[PDB]
Amino acid sequence: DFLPFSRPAMGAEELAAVKTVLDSGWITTGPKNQELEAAFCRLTGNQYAVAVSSATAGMHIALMALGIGEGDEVITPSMTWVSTLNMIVLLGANPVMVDVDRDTLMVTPEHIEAAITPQTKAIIPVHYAGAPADLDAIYALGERYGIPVIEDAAHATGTSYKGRHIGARGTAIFSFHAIKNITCAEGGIVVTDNPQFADKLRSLKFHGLGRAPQAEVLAPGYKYNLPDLNAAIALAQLQKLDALNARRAAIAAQYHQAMADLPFQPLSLPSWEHIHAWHLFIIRVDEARCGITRDALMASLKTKGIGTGLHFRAAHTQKYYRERFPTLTLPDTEWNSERICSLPLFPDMTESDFDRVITALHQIAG
């Protein structure tokens, strides 16, 4: 009875939503997309939303829409999924990786400010694991220097920062991937407060068109539209958001309590006021403190039928980036990269499950 680190919360509502779309005969981008965009604006408090085929696609067209390319620099942490780095590189721009807080894994204003040059054209903070980054300080940097801020909110559907939802202002990109807080297997959405930018996003995700028979390419774009079939599933999940996040939050609490009697070190919560979406429950496994390495712990758990994730192996430690940036050193990122792992955490997780994990942890924890 394998216990994976994540499971989608799929039930009768998701199936019913698909049945309705299949029965209507309008299966690709249409009214369900328009509805999902309207719901994300209502959810966040922002003015415009562009649904896409994934958050990676959303990042690609966001950077593309800013006109980022050869000669430009984009500040981002290395502690994030490589898709952001890849999109910066593939547009022909230069990623400038900066370090993160040692216990929250979030990019600091200091690390960002120190990397700013006249070539910096975007700053991409990540709301890590469900908690929010220090937006007030980051936007201030953005405004002082005239640099766009594009928030990676793939872990943050349901996250709040100092009384306001992530995505309420500025530009934020959410993900509907299978292990994310809400899902339609693959999908994402770009929420923004800028109408000209939103218009560019809509065109770039659909062939650069301004479909009608005499529609025409205004400027070449990609194909990243989200089918209504998947959009309807996302809408069904979005309706369940509070209950689903409430279950993750409760399980995070037990983990917290359980960790008191264990040597593994969970992340620290940011100091600012916030609401945590609890996308992941990450722990650090330092061999000298725990007696076991991170890799050994993950493999031990797997033997016990317990799955774990690794979010993330820092971008700068992966082949292409190691060879392109050989002298790049980011201590707090590397320290965590060698020691983090994500424990089972999903809305349908039971106590049999939970307790199964903790019992495996004690078995291995000394």
Ligand SMILES: O=C(O)CCC(=O)C(=O)O
């Ligand atoms: O299954 C996918 O399409 C992507 C999975 C992913 O990005 C991940 O490693 O977390």
